Amino acid sequence: RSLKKGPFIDLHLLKKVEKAVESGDKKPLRTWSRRSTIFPNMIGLTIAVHNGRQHVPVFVTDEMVGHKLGEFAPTRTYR
């Protein structure tokens, strides 16, 4: 629901992703930017998204492109 003038992604996460894909398979990416959009060059990486207390590991697939990172890290515990 952001305008159609381009998606948003935090710059530090962008540079982390480029350094991760250019250097081959790496460790999970620890990030707090739940608001960043999942881009096609992130397919294959597992980003550890902060959820408030932990960094939830999220293995990115082609079906996730377009979502925000926080959509795969629930912040509230309910049983």
């Binding site: 079906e63 996730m64 979502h67 959509e71 795969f72």
Partner: protein
């Protein structure tokens, strides 16, 4: 009569009778009747079969029928299998679009149970 949308619309004003199709509202019904050439205030009776074939030819342009149900089921299933926030809200029958769950979630939660 019957349409490429299997469903059988009632014999009443064409603009409202075409709404019985799943996927055709008022705007799309008016657009179908305009692109076909039929008035909106004429009943489904008094319509020639050549005119109903015309309406079928126009409704064939839209994905409006069990096909649309299939595309909606596919999207909800993709959400649920992805495990995203909306997927979890769909799994538990809770409101998906940010509505409050403290009170007033009766459409998604159904009749209340103690």
């Amino acid at each position: 009569a019957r349409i490429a949308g299997i469903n059988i619309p009632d014999h009443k004003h064409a603009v409202i009778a075409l709404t019985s199709i799943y996927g055709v509202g008022k705007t799309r019904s008016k657009a179908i009747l305009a692109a076909a050439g039929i008035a909106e205030d004429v009943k489904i009776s008094e319509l020639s079969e050549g005119q109903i074939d015309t309406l079928r030819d126009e409704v064939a342009k839209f994905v409006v029928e069990g096909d649309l149900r299939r595309e909606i089921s596919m999207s909800i299933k993709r959400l649920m299998d992805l495990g995203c926030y909306r997927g979890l809200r769909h799994r538990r029958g809770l409101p998906v679009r940010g509505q409050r769950t403290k009170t007033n979630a009766r459409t998604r939660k159904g009749p209340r149970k103690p």
